[PDB]
Design a protein around this ligand. Sequence first.
Ligand SMILES: CC(=O)N[C@H]1[C@H]([C@H](O)[C@H](O)CO)O[C@](O)(C(=O)O)C[C@@H]1O
Length: 305
Amino acid sequence: KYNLKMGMTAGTSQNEYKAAEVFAKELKKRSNGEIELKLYPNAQLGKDDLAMMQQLEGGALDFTFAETGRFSTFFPEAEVFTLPYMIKDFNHMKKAVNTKFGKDLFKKVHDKKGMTVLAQAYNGTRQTTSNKAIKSLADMKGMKLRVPGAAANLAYAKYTEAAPTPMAFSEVYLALQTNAVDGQENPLSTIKAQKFYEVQKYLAMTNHILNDQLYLVSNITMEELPENLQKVVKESAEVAAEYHTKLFMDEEKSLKDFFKSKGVTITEPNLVDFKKAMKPFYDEYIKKNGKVGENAIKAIEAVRL
Ligand SMILES: CC(=O)N[C@H]1[C@H]([C@H](O)[C@H](O)CO)O[C@](O)(C(=O)O)C[C@@H]1O
């Protein structure tokens, strides 16, 4: 019997965990009990996604979650997948990772980082919450905006003239409650699941970064499994990914109504000022990655539709 482990930053209330439960359910079903997957949420295995991805390389951890743009830590050119206002929708994201650039990235992740991408899911589009109303770009000036330890999110806070305040995901609620920070930044689904709306009187539809979610498996783990069970793992992830995608999609259809009923004021500021403010980070990306970065942008821009 194969007792596998899956770690994640998301809590048990979030859609990521719900889809992971389906993943474990499919694994046990399609393997006739040979494969049993235990879930380890709330980042109880490591600091963040970066720590758990490193655990997959060593084979200590079998499965974990990761955004495609998060691979920029290992392959700098992959940051194009998480550049602010670069990805339009999930259909664009699906096609963006299926470019020659996207396919080469996953291939490099396999060859050099010991991780195999099983499936891709939609993990929501990020918005901005605050204790004060954000109706223009000037309203975010000097606010202590919490962001994850990622360059794209840090840049978004910086070029909106906010004060980038990086901290762990588990420490966000308390920080908002005690007004240590003035606001955070996450998809609507995450905002509801982690109940950030309980401590945030405002919500700005900024739509700056789209998050996908990759079902990663350790290369060592796949090597320890019979070939037919490796196919089970692949198929189980694809099933969960669809369920994963549908969860975020369904909520984003009616979550704005939910928040407004809870007394949260939802603003929809003009985003052409937001998009224009992100230009120096694009220059930053290009200067760091050179022609590789330029061609990557033009390749992903082409499949936006
Ligand atoms: C797979 C994964 O760990 N996603 C996490 C992301 C990424 O760490 C970040 O976007 C960088 O890619 O940040 C969070 O949204 C956050 O801290 O607010 C939590 C979320 O669980």
